[PDB]
Amino acid sequence: RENLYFQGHMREHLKLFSLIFSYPDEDKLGKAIALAEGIGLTEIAQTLKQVDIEALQVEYTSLFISSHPSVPCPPYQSYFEEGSVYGKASLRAAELYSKYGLNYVYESEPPDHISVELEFLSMNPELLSDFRDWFLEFAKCVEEKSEIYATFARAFRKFLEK
């Protein structure tokens, strides 16, 4: 169930992107290739539908988790806004999640991580206008800085560029 009376899929779309930008797995890849198909965004579905999970991770990891020098495109709106991970962004993120009375029940990751902010916007898309450019300086970084992921990374920009 997604809605039988209001035209169309932004929220749905957002959740896809949030999925597209976590560390991947059989399940996430499942859900995504599915949201993808449901919301009908198509090429972005095959692209997903047909990749070697092992390798997918690996890029993910080369891109976001491990420090080659430092991580390529650290997926935090602190690194991007402020320089380090775990900064004012993070307090602000979190502040607002709680302002929206969402309960951030999460462990591994700071609240200012993209994948999260996305789940959040997929619930309150009003506020995209806000979280956008960060969602973007990012979007480009990934688009330039590496290959499997790039597709999405563009598609994403392409997305919020509309």
Q: Which CATH architecture has domain 1-67+146-162?
A: Up-down Bundle (1.20)
Distances (CA, A) of 133 to 14, 51, 81, 130, 161: 15, 29, 10, 8, 10
Cβ(134)–Cβ(77) under 8 Å?
Answer: yes
Resolution of the solved structure (Å): 3.4
Are the C-beta atoms of residues 109 and 117 closer than 8 Å to each other? no
CATH architecture of 68-145: Orthogonal Bundle (1.10)
Alpha carbon distance 102, 104 (integer Å): 6
* Domain residue extents for the chain: 1-67+146-162, 68-145
Residue pair 136/73 in contact (Cβ under 8 Å)? The answer is: no
Rounded distance between C-alpha atoms, residue 3 and residue 38, angstroms:
12
For residue 99, count other CB atoms closer than 10 A to its CB.
Answer: 9
C-alpha 111/C-alpha 75 separation (Å) is 11
Task: Dihedral sign for Cα 55, 148, 14, 126, please.
Answer: positive
Residue 117 tokens read as 């902010």
